[PDB]
Design a protein around this motif. Structure first.
Motif, PDB file in Angstrom:
ATOM      1  N   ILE B  24      29.801 -33.683  46.871  1.00 37.46           N
ATOM      2  CA  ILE B  24      30.560 -32.674  46.795  1.00 37.46           C
ATOM      3  C   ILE B  24      29.946 -31.079  46.852  1.00 37.46           C
ATOM      4  CG2 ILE B  24      32.005 -33.752  45.404  1.00 37.46           C
ATOM      5  CD1 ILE B  24      30.966 -32.214  42.985  1.00 37.46           C
ATOM      6  N   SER B  25      30.430 -30.110  46.850  1.00 39.51           N
ATOM      7  CA  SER B  25      30.112 -28.776  47.165  1.00 39.51           C
ATOM      8  C   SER B  25      29.848 -28.408  45.791  1.00 39.51           C
ATOM      9  CB  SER B  25      31.074 -27.954  47.984  1.00 39.51           C
ATOM     10  OG  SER B  25      31.648 -28.640  49.129  1.00 39.51           O
ATOM     11  N   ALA B  26      28.837 -27.449  45.796  1.00 39.14           N
ATOM     12  CA  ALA B  26      28.708 -26.688  44.554  1.00 39.14           C
ATOM     13  C   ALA B  26      28.206 -25.271  45.046  1.00 39.14           C
ATOM     14  CB  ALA B  26      27.479 -27.200  43.704  1.00 39.14           C
ATOM     15  N   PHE B  27      28.647 -24.250  44.073  1.00 37.28           N
ATOM     16  CA  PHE B  27      28.392 -22.881  44.314  1.00 37.28           C
ATOM     17  C   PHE B  27      27.914 -22.394  42.890  1.00 37.28           C
ATOM     18  CE2 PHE B  27      30.844 -22.373  48.253  1.00 37.28           C
ATOM     19  CZ  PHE B  27      31.517 -23.686  48.303  1.00 37.28           C
ATOM     20  N   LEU B  28      26.769 -22.362  42.919  1.00 37.18           N
ATOM     21  CA  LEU B  28      25.908 -21.835  41.559  1.00 37.18           C
ATOM     22  C   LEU B  28      25.493 -20.843  41.683  1.00 37.18           C
ATOM     23  CD1 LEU B  28      23.688 -25.469  41.854  1.00 37.18           C
ATOM     24  CD2 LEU B  28      26.076 -24.870  40.960  1.00 37.18           C
ATOM     25  N   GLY B  29      25.312 -19.953  40.453  1.00 34.34           N
ATOM     26  CA  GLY B  29      25.059 -18.778  40.310  1.00 34.34           C
ATOM     27  C   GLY B  29      25.550 -17.656  41.109  1.00 34.34           C
ATOM     28  N   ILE B  30      26.924 -17.552  40.993  1.00 29.27           N
ATOM     29  CA  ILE B  30      27.959 -16.562  41.586  1.00 29.27           C
ATOM     30  C   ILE B  30      27.852 -15.377  40.387  1.00 29.27           C
ATOM     31  CG2 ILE B  30      30.048 -15.869  42.176  1.00 29.27           C
ATOM     32  CD1 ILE B  30      30.525 -18.791  42.913  1.00 29.27           C
ATOM     33  N   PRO B  31      27.681 -14.449  40.744  1.00 27.67           N
ATOM     34  CA  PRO B  31      27.881 -13.201  39.938  1.00 27.67           C
ATOM     35  C   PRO B  31      29.188 -12.694  39.598  1.00 27.67           C
ATOM     36  CG  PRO B  31      27.150 -12.160  41.809  1.00 27.67           C
ATOM     37  CD  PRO B  31      27.167 -13.641  42.137  1.00 27.67           C
ATOM     38  N   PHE B  32      29.671 -12.433  38.380  1.00 29.56           N
ATOM     39  CA  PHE B  32      30.955 -12.045  38.003  1.00 29.56           C
ATOM     40  C   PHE B  32      30.820 -10.537  37.290  1.00 29.56           C
ATOM     41  CE2 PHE B  32      29.925 -14.786  34.202  1.00 29.56           C
ATOM     42  CZ  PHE B  32      30.347 -13.934  33.207  1.00 29.56           C
ATOM     43  N   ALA B  33      29.749 -10.051  36.973  1.00 28.23           N
ATOM     44  CA  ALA B  33      29.479  -8.711  36.271  1.00 28.23           C
ATOM     45  C   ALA B  33      28.414  -8.091  36.802  1.00 28.23           C
ATOM     46  CB  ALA B  33      29.605  -9.111  34.897  1.00 28.23           C
ATOM     47  N   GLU B  34      28.334  -6.885  36.641  1.00 33.24           N
ATOM     48  CA  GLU B  34      27.087  -6.036  36.806  1.00 33.24           C
ATOM     49  C   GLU B  34      26.081  -6.595  35.997  1.00 33.24           C
ATOM     50  OE1 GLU B  34      26.058  -3.671  38.758  1.00 33.24           O
ATOM     51  OE2 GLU B  34      27.468  -4.663  40.060  1.00 33.24           O
ATOM     52  N   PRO B  35      24.883  -6.695  36.127  1.00 31.47           N
ATOM     53  CA  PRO B  35      23.748  -7.086  35.173  1.00 31.47           C
ATOM     54  C   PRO B  35      23.697  -6.051  34.016  1.00 31.47           C
ATOM     55  CG  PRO B  35      22.931  -7.002  37.397  1.00 31.47           C
ATOM     56  CD  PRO B  35      24.358  -6.514  37.404  1.00 31.47           C
ATOM     57  N   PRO B  36      23.669  -6.649  32.695  1.00 31.35           N
ATOM     58  CA  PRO B  36      23.993  -5.780  31.583  1.00 31.35           C
ATOM     59  C   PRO B  36      22.697  -5.465  31.044  1.00 31.35           C
ATOM     60  CG  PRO B  36      24.177  -8.081  31.196  1.00 31.35           C
ATOM     61  CD  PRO B  36      24.198  -7.891  32.457  1.00 31.35           C
ATOM     62  N   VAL B  37      21.881  -4.511  31.764  1.00 28.02           N
ATOM     63  CA  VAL B  37      20.389  -4.231  31.615  1.00 28.02           C
ATOM     64  C   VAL B  37      20.366  -2.945  31.414  1.00 28.02           C
ATOM     65  CG1 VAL B  37      19.772  -5.986  33.163  1.00 28.02           C
ATOM     66  CG2 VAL B  37      19.706  -3.698  34.103  1.00 28.02           C
ATOM     67  N   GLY B  38      19.323  -2.439  30.714  1.00 23.70           N
ATOM     68  CA  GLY B  38      18.886  -0.955  30.486  1.00 23.70           C
ATOM     69  C   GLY B  38      19.990  -0.382  29.776  1.00 23.70           C
ATOM     70  N   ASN B  39      20.515   0.628  30.006  1.00 19.95           N
ATOM     71  CA  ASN B  39      21.603   1.343  29.062  1.00 19.95           C
ATOM     72  C   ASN B  39      23.020   0.469  29.206  1.00 19.95           C
ATOM     73  N   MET B  40      23.026  -0.340  29.723  1.00 17.81           N
ATOM     74  CA  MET B  40      24.271  -1.323  29.722  1.00 17.81           C
ATOM     75  C   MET B  40      23.830  -2.405  28.733  1.00 17.81           C
ATOM     76  SD  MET B  40      25.706  -1.691  33.557  1.00 17.81           S
ATOM     77  CE  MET B  40      26.782  -3.099  32.941  1.00 17.81           C
ATOM     78  N   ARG B  41      22.801  -2.402  27.789  1.00 21.33           N
ATOM     79  CA  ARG B  41      22.660  -3.619  26.859  1.00 21.33           C
ATOM     80  C   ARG B  41      23.590  -3.255  25.806  1.00 21.33           C
ATOM     81  NH1 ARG B  41      16.805  -4.287  24.330  1.00 21.33           N
ATOM     82  NH2 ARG B  41      16.411  -5.458  26.205  1.00 21.33           N
ATOM     83  N   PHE B  42      24.152  -4.232  25.331  1.00 21.02           N
ATOM     84  CA  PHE B  42      25.231  -3.993  24.284  1.00 21.02           C
ATOM     85  C   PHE B  42      26.553  -3.431  24.580  1.00 21.02           C
ATOM     86  CE2 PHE B  42      21.137  -2.888  21.721  1.00 21.02           C
ATOM     87  CZ  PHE B  42      21.027  -4.361  21.479  1.00 21.02           C
TER      88      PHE B  42
END
Ligand SMILES: *[C@@H]1O[C@H](CO)[C@@H](O[C@@H]2O[C@H](CO)[C@@H](O[C@@H]3O[C@H](CO)[C@@H](O)[C@H](O[C@H]4O[C@H](CO)[C@@H](O)[C@H](O)[C@@H]4O)[C@@H]3O)[C@H](O)[C@H]2NC(C)=O)[C@H](O)[C@H]1NC(C)=O
Ligand SMILES: *[C@@H]1O[C@H](CO)[C@@H](O[C@@H]2O[C@H](CO)[C@@H](O[C@@H]3O[C@H](CO)[C@@H](O)[C@H](O[C@H]4O[C@H](CO)[C@@H](O)[C@H](O)[C@@H]4O)[C@@H]3O)[C@H](O)[C@H]2NC(C)=O)[C@H](O)[C@H]1NC(C)=O
Ligand SMILES: *[C@@H]1O[C@H](CO)[C@@H](O[C@@H]2O[C@H](CO)[C@@H](O[C@@H]3O[C@H](CO)[C@@H](O)[C@H](O[C@H]4O[C@H](CO)[C@@H](O)[C@H](O)[C@@H]4O)[C@@H]3O)[C@H](O)[C@H]2NC(C)=O)[C@H](O)[C@H]1NC(C)=O
Ligand SMILES: *[C@@H]1O[C@H](CO)[C@@H](O[C@@H]2O[C@H](CO)[C@@H](O[C@@H]3O[C@H](CO)[C@@H](O)[C@H](O[C@H]4O[C@H](CO)[C@@H](O)[C@H](O)[C@@H]4O)[C@@H]3O)[C@H](O)[C@H]2NC(C)=O)[C@H](O)[C@H]1NC(C)=O
Ligand SMILES: COc1ccc2c(c1)C/C(=C\C1CCN(Cc3ccccc3)CC1)C2=O
Ligand SMILES: COc1ccc2c(c1)C/C(=C\C1CCN(Cc3ccccc3)CC1)C2=O
Ligand SMILES: *[C@@H]1O[C@H](CO[C@@H]2O[C@@H](C)[C@@H](O)[C@@H](O)[C@@H]2O)[C@@H](O)[C@H](O)[C@H]1NC(C)=O
Ligand SMILES: *[C@@H]1O[C@H](CO[C@@H]2O[C@@H](C)[C@@H](O)[C@@H](O)[C@@H]2O)[C@@H](O)[C@H](O)[C@H]1NC(C)=O
Lengths: 532, 532
Positions: B24-42
């Motif tokens: 079958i086909s697999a699509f692994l690791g597709i991003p659905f949001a911006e990285p919640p890093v730095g000042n975006m934490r919480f």
């Protein structure tokens, strides 16, 4: 003559009576106190002034003034409990059945009748001592005591209506047995006192009461225990009930002396007519004028006495019937009647619950309901009926008794515990009532030995075997014959908690009688009602 | 190409994967949001900015930063739950498994991982979608969401750490599936969301949350329900926990803005190291940073929402495992260990009870103990162990779920209820743990179909049959085939309350799942703790 006995109170003449194709002597209607009449109503009993001449003791005496059950006129089931002689305030008498020929020093058994402390009689057919006297060679005594307000009106602090006078009646008859039974051939140092229901609680109370303990040697309690929630009240509750009794009769209530004087002018039936009006709650298995925790007969609370070992240390034999609650649901609770199966709706259940535990906040009523409800089958009418039968039995009879037994056995000298669950084959009450409160009595007094009464052969065997357990226990402190081949009723001990079934099947031993439910009733629920 | 899909976010390239002698086909690791890093934490998640070029989706992404279980290093039983990729704050990705050839519009299943809201990963072997995609011809999605303080720190009133951000992660992935799954051949109007444990509660919460309801069609909840006592806290408790987390890290606590700024400078492992320090009670089955009842995601209390019908009305399939509590006793309670039978003393029981119901006064602890103790056998160590397993299971998983089910089913459009009680034959955890929390999962994802993993033939049959129930339900709202000859899983209704067992034996139907104990937990005990 065999039927003349000189006693310290005077001579008495008995009568010869047939019993199972033989004969024994009976001395019926012997007075042990002065008539508690007139200004003596509500007073402590006084000893009978000795008499010259021969007291005719050939016939049963009067029953005390009491409520008479009229719910099923002519029905033997209910009428076998009612007074079978004229009622009178002049009722402090005892009856003695003596083997023939007269023994020299034999074991004595003293029967204290039940009746919720509001009724009962020594003269009932099912309390006839002759079969037991004759079969086991005991001298069988039955005493009487004042019931209802006559026995138990309580104005603590007053000497004219102190409370507990009915228990003092019993104590005086036991004094009298102590002092005179030797003359009838009984042995005063081997007196077993035995009682059913309030009779059983009465037994327990004489075990606890310092003024009673020396007067007897050992004790049998049937479906009754001195700590039953119905068998005593505080002095404030007693007081309240007696004032309210006077309120029901238009009495001057300004003083103990005004009220008592007023209650003393009334005809006995006037008091009986309004007795049930003073109960504080809408309740079943509750009676108006019962023993009071006075500081005198009972020096402290029953629980502190039981806990500290402040009671007589001796042997006790004791137990319960399988379906103790049934009678009280029949008479007192909506949905139960004598001629139906009495399947109960969810709503007659909840109502029943509330009548059964009257001192109880809503959380307590929920805790009870939860304990007894099969939630996979909550609308089974058989289960709700049986469920309520168990609640009433457990709360009022089985778990108090089990708590008495466990506390007593830490300080006592030998305990024997039974669970009677044979339903008599000829029982006229309906089936749903099962093994009803009071229907071991007939087996204890030997009535199945009489062909005419229609018990089965196996029931005659059960009765003989119960008579022998009871009489051997009275004799030795142990219901078993030392070296019989028969199976052995073991001792109830603190650790193992053994007991036997009494029925027509070969003896079985179990442990921890209704422990799951008695922990609810003896530990969890009182904790729950204290915290709320 | 079959492995190139153009989506509204950009092109992605998948990979072909073998599965049961096919592909079958697999699509692994597709991003659905911006990285919640730095000042975006919480912070609330932000949507992924679309990309030019082809996003390589051939490999699993990072797992979110979480507590890693080290109690049994190398033991597969525990390690099969731990992150199998590097951990990173950059973890908002999803994986998609698509039949081959690509379908045009097929039923979509979206898996939300459990982990007590403090851990979990989409990448675990036991959550591999390929067997289920392939066997039932569904498009299987697995999303990820932030866990622990990263997902659930809650300073209500602040916009920088509002609470519930991990549930908003899930919501965004479901938005993304709504908006893009058509391009992979899935049908966006037939999206079933399914989850275990906190995954299951997460499912229930999207059913209740107005902002989530439109994004999916129907729901499966495995051993988890949105009202579990562990799955949310008030805003005051959230606040308290976040301040205390900052206290553990020497943060300035004078303002939301000082505290958040401080928490944002810390390396992730610093937060993980002290997370367990903020729990208010000594407890098991309690996790520090969980969903908060905020008035926004959840507009009112969960119970008022469930009572008033304020939730999505649709079909649900749902159930529990026989021995839900075992895991939590192993890890958290004295006397339970992995390599003994863990017979429990009276004293480890009572201690266990107190860890299990942490919000509870002594009367409540007594009520629980009474409910689960066989007083004829109170020192059986097997019974005390099994007794505590049941208490933990019932209080935390089974009875909340049963309360969810009964409330939902009055307004909903079809309920199907199961009780899974097959213990996998190859389970590496000890026997005393029984049918352990999480061990239906492997049957749902089809792992028994793989010879190498050592399940029995009958277990392969059970798995095929569970996959088909789950996929048919996702497809139609009903797990049964319309005109099969096979036995039928009936509908759970308000009146009859039917459910089935899931195991290797022919289907049995019962009624009223653990009703005796869930009335205790859902009705009597909360009443008791309110009145005291
Ligand atoms: C009802 O009460 C009676 C009498 O009160 C009671 O019988 C008594 O049992 C005790 C046992 O506790 C006996 O005491 C023993 O006396 C003998 C000599 O007479 C001693 O040798 C014993 O001591 C040895 O064994 C002891 C173990 O108990 C050891 O502690 C000790 O080191 C010795 O090795 C012991 O003191 C007592 O003699 C009898 N009394 C009579 C008159 O039988 C009976 O047990 C009670 N029944 C119930 C059910 O409670
Ligand atoms: C032992 O078992 C036997 C057999 O079952 C039993 O004998 C029966 O006793 C009852 C007495 O209660 C008898 O029933 C009566 O029969 C007469 C004559 O036929 C009737 O007139 C009676 O009817 C009157 O009484 C009824 C209510 O009490 C009224 O409903 C009606 O209007 C009449 O007033 C009454 O039915 C029965 O005939 C005998 N049977 C035999 C074979 O003798 C005996 O009572 C049991 N022994 C004990 C001590 O219980
Ligand atoms: C899930 O939801 C669906 C749709 O909302 C639902 O199916 C519906 O069932 C109802 C029954 O309550 C159907 O309503 C019927 O419509 C027909 C004509 O279309 C009428 O003839 C019916 O009226 C007769 O019978 C009634 C008894 O319900 C009587 O009250 C009345 O006097 C008449 O004799 C009735 O109004 C409705 O048509 C379907 N809808 C569809 C599209 O199928 C289903 O039951 C729900 N599932 C669950 C498990 O709740
Ligand atoms: C399906 O079932 C089979 C059969 O039961 C099973 O195969 C077994 O797997 C384990 C691997 O975990 C093997 O055990 C190893 O054997 C080697 C060689 O003899 C040893 O050196 C190994 O010892 C090391 O590891 C141990 C701990 O993990 C240490 O205690 C020790 O110090 C060494 O470091 C180890 O015992 C076993 O030999 C095979 N058996 C066969 C027949 O192949 C298989 O794992 C199951 N499949 C699945 C997916 O579970
Ligand atoms: C207002 O009058 C009432 C109220 C309540 C009750 C009664 C009368 C009777 C009753 C129960 C039964 C209990 C058993 N009694 C028979 C019996 C007496 C003595 C020992 C055992 C059984 C008959 C009455 C009651 O519960
Ligand atoms: C301070 O660290 C702690 C404290 C408590 C617990 C744990 C760690 C772990 C734990 C229970 C198990 C619960 C089941 N988990 C496996 C699992 C994960 C996801 C779905 C199902 C099962 C592993 C940990 C606990 O109860
Ligand atoms: C003793 O009494 C027997 C029965 O007494 C009955 O009741 C008393 C109150 C009298 O009214 C009596 O007539 C009743 O029959 C007598 O049968 C018996 O003869 C009496 N014996 C003596 C010596 O008095
Ligand atoms: C897509 O990626 C495949 C595997 O990627 C692996 O991880 C990334 C981060 C790289 O470091 C890579 O070298 C690793 O192997 C590759 O095998 C594949 O060739 C890639 N294809 C394209 C078109 O980029």
């Amino acid at each position: 003559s065999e039927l003349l006995v000189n006693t310290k109170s005077g001579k008495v003449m008995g009568t010869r009576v047939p019993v199972l194709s033989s004969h024994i002597s009976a001395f019926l209607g012997i007075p042990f106190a002065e008539p508690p009449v007139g200004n003596m109503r509500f007073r402590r009993p006084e000893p009978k002034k000795p008499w010259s001449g021969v007291w005719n003791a050939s016939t049963y005496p009067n029953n005390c003034q009491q409520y008479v059950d009229e719910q099923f006129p002519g029905f033997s089931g209910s009428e076998m409990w009612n007074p079978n002689r004229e009622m009178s305030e002049d009722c402090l008498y005892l009856n003695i059945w003596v083997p023939s020929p007269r023994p020299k020093s034999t074991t004595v058994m003293v029967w204290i009748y039940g009746g919720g402390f509001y009724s009962g009689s020594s003269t009932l057919d099912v309390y006839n001592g002759k079969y037991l006297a004759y079969t086991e060679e005991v001298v069988l005594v039955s005493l009487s005591y004042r019931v209802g307000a006559f026995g138990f009106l309580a104005l603590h602090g007053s000497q004219e209506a102190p409370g507990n006078v009915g228990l003092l009646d019993q104590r005086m008859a036991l004094q009298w047995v102590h002092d005179n039974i030797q003359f009838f051939g009984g042995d005063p140092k081997t007196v077993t006192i035995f009682g059913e229901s309030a009779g059983g609680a009465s037994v327990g109370m004489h075990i606890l009461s310092p003024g009673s303990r020396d007067l007897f040697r050992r004790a049998i309690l049937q479906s009754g225990s001195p700590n039953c929630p119905w068998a005593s009240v505080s002095v404030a509750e007693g007081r309240r009930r007696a004032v309210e009794l006077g309120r029901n009769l238009n009495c001057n209530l300004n003083s103990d002396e005004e009220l008592i004087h007023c209650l003393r002018e009334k005809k006995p039936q006037e008091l009986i007519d309004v007795e049930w009006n003073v109960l504080p709650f809408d309740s079943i298995f509750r009676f108006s004028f019962v023993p009071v925790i006075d500081g005198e007969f009972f020096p402290t609370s029953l629980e502190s006495m039981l806990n500290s070992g402040n009671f007589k240390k001796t042997q006790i034999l004791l137990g319960v019937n399988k379906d103790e609650g049934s009678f009280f649901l029949l008479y007192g609770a909506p949905g139960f009647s004598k001629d139906s199966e009495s399947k109960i709706s969810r709503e007659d259940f909840m109502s029943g619950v509330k009548l059964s535990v009257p001192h109880a906040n809503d959380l307590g009523l929920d805790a009870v309901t939860l304990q007894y409800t099969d939630w996979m089958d909550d609308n089974n009418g058989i289960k709700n009926r049986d469920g309520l039968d168990d609640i009433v039995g457990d709360h009022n009879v089985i778990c108090p008794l089990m708590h008495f037994v466990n506390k007593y056995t830490k300080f006592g000298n030998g305990t024997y515990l039974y669970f009677f669950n044979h339903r008599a084959s000829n029982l006229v009450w309906p089936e749903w009532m099962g093994v009803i409160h009071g229907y071991e009595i007939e087996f204890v007094f030997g009535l199945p030995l009489v062909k005419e009464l229609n018990y089965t052969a196996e029931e005659e065997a059960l009765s003989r075997r119960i008579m022998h357990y009871w009489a051997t226990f009275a004799k030795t402190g142990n219901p078993n014959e030392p070296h019989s081949q028969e199976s052995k009723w073991p001792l109830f001990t603190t650790k193992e908690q053994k007991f036997i079934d009494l029925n027509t099947e070969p003896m079985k031993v179990h442990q921890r009688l209704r422990v799951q439910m008695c922990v609810f009733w003896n530990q969890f629920l009182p904790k729950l009602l204290n915290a709320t």
